[PDB]
């Protein structure tokens, strides 16, 4: 069989010739589908059974069917992920041979209407919300440090300025700080056809913050190509709910305040004034912990900075190195 | 005098234990336990708030940042011990 042998090793050589090739963009998976029955690849690899929202960033402009790539971990080896159209057209192929996929039943009623199943069980409609396959993210992951209360309110960011000092000490060679005065929790690029771009065009969505809140999507995303989670001051996420829907999916770090009794003297130590909002700073705080991490999967229950900063350090100590 | 005092000690200790066991059953150690962790964090986070008091973005960062370090440098902890030993001497 000259056909199989003459090409099969094509992928093996081209994923190692430019071993120093620089990665770009990113991928956020949703289905870990194996490849013993779904190989269809020149790499001869087993499959793409990685995870939902897997960690790998890819730029190799391969054919219109599959995308040979790289996985970021302790090893800097090369990987493989199917092209977005491949996962789109095959997410029904794994259910294409599902016999009664249209409407006929196998419940002893064989011959009622018969006929091939309707085309609607394909990508002819698929109109839940027209949600695409794997989503990109920056060359790094954006950062959120939720806690202890509504950011910018006395103590709130003062728990972050101290946390950003050793951070910038470990960084500054890694640092990529920015301060965003725009609401990502009120920002979603899933607009219908075209977001607002003009200024006085006299449209129904002209005097909207969407124009100046999507403008820093470019200040994030592929701008992170030099590798950097990119922290921010965003007074946007007081709960990991609105942020973790779109392609952002940020690094959510939760500084724990333990029981709702140590923050009393933490916020009342300044005496008068600080209770302008009263409840929320001690209500929005446990309104966060309320839900599970996974988003703020990072938790920071720790005393004086000396070891408290270590939790941030050890997270990014492995993370930064294992990303090349 | 010795046997009798031993009996008194035994009967009193077994009676104090047979009341601390009741107190634990009702619950009083929890108040002491959950109070010591409270001031532990109030000695904790509340020092962390003061560690950001001098992050200046009027020139105390040159010296006050070293004052904190020196106090917890195991040098200002041994110097004071030596001074206390001298005072005792």
UniProtKB/Swiss-Prot annotation, chain A:
GO terms for cellular component: cytosol; L-type voltage-gated calcium channel complex; membrane; synapse; voltage-gated calcium channel complex. Keywords: Calcium, Calcium channel, Calcium transport, Cytoplasm, Ion channel, Ion transport, Phosphoprotein, SH3 domain, Transport, Voltage-gated channel. It is found in: Cytoplasm. Expressed mostly in brain, colon and ovary. Belongs to the calcium channel beta subunit family. Its main location: cytoplasm. Residues 22-91 form the SH3 domain. GO terms for molecular function: calcium channel regulator activity; high voltage-gated calcium channel activity; voltage-gated calcium channel activity. This is Voltage-dependent L-type calcium channel subunit beta-3. One of its GO terms (biological process) is calcium ion transport. The gene is CACNB3. Component of a calcium channel complex consisting of a pore-forming alpha subunit (CACNA1C) and the ancillary subunits CACNB3 and CACNA2D1. The channel complex contains alpha, beta, gamma and delta subunits in a 1:1:1:1 ratio. Interacts with CACNA2D4. Interacts with FASLG. Interacts with CBARP; prevents the interaction of CACNB3 with the alpha subunit CACNA1C thereby negatively regulating the activity of the corresponding calcium channel. Residues 158-308 are annotated as: Mediates interaction with the alpha subunit. The lineage of its organism: Eukaryota, Metazoa, Chordata, Craniata, Vertebrata. It comes from Homo sapiens. Regulatory subunit of the voltage-gated calcium channel that gives rise to L-type calcium currents. Increases CACNA1B peak calcium current and shifts the voltage dependencies of channel activation and inactivation. Increases CACNA1C peak calcium current and shifts the voltage dependencies of channel activation and inactivation. Residues 92-133 are annotated as: Disordered. The modification Phosphoserine is found at residue 115. It comes from the Eukaryota.
From Swiss-Prot, chain B:
Residues 36-53 are annotated as: AID/alpha-interaction domain. Detected throughout the brain, including hippocampus, cerebellum and amygdala, throughout the heart and vascular system, including ductus arteriosus, in urinary bladder, and in retina and sclera in the eye. Expressed in brain, heart, jejunum, ovary, pancreatic beta-cells and vascular smooth muscle. Overall expression is reduced in atherosclerotic vascular smooth muscle. The chain crosses the membrane at residues 75-89. Changing residue 14 to R: In TS; causes a nearly complete loss of voltage-dependent channel inactivation. Elevated levels of blood glucose lead to increased phosphorylation by PKA. It is found in: Cell membrane; Cell membrane, Sarcolemma; Perikaryon; Postsynaptic density membrane. Pore-forming, alpha-1C subunit of the voltage-gated calcium channel that gives rise to L-type calcium currents. Mediates influx of calcium ions into the cytoplasm, and thereby triggers calcium release from the sarcoplasm. Plays an important role in excitation-contraction coupling in the heart. Required for normal heart development and normal regulation of heart rhythm. Required for normal contraction of smooth muscle cells in blood vessels and in the intestine. Essential for normal blood pressure regulation via its role in the contraction of arterial smooth muscle cells. (Microbial infection) Acts as a receptor for Influenzavirus. May play a critical role in allowing virus entry when sialylated and expressed on lung tissues. Component of a calcium channel complex consisting of a pore-forming alpha subunit (CACNA1C) and ancillary beta, gamma and delta subunits. The channel complex contains alpha, beta, gamma and delta subunits in a 1:1:1:1 ratio, i.e. it contains only one of each type of subunit. CACNA1C channel activity is modulated by ancillary subunits, such as CACNB1, CACNB2, CACNB3, CACNA2D1 and CACNA2D4. Interacts with the gamma subunits CACNG4, CACNG6, CACNG7 and CACNG8. Interacts with CACNB1. Interacts with CACNB2. Identified in a complex with CACNA2D4 and CACNB3. Interacts with CACNB3. (Microbial infection) Interacts with influenzavirus H1 hemagglutinin. Each of the four internal repeats contains five hydrophobic transmembrane segments (S1, S2, S3, S5, S6) and one positively charged transmembrane segment (S4). S4 segments probably represent the voltage-sensor and are characterized by a series of positively charged amino acids at every third position. Belongs to the calcium channel alpha-1 subunit (TC 1.A.1.11) family. CACNA1C subfamily. This is Voltage-dependent L-type calcium channel subunit alpha-1C. It comes from Homo sapiens. The gene is CACNA1C.
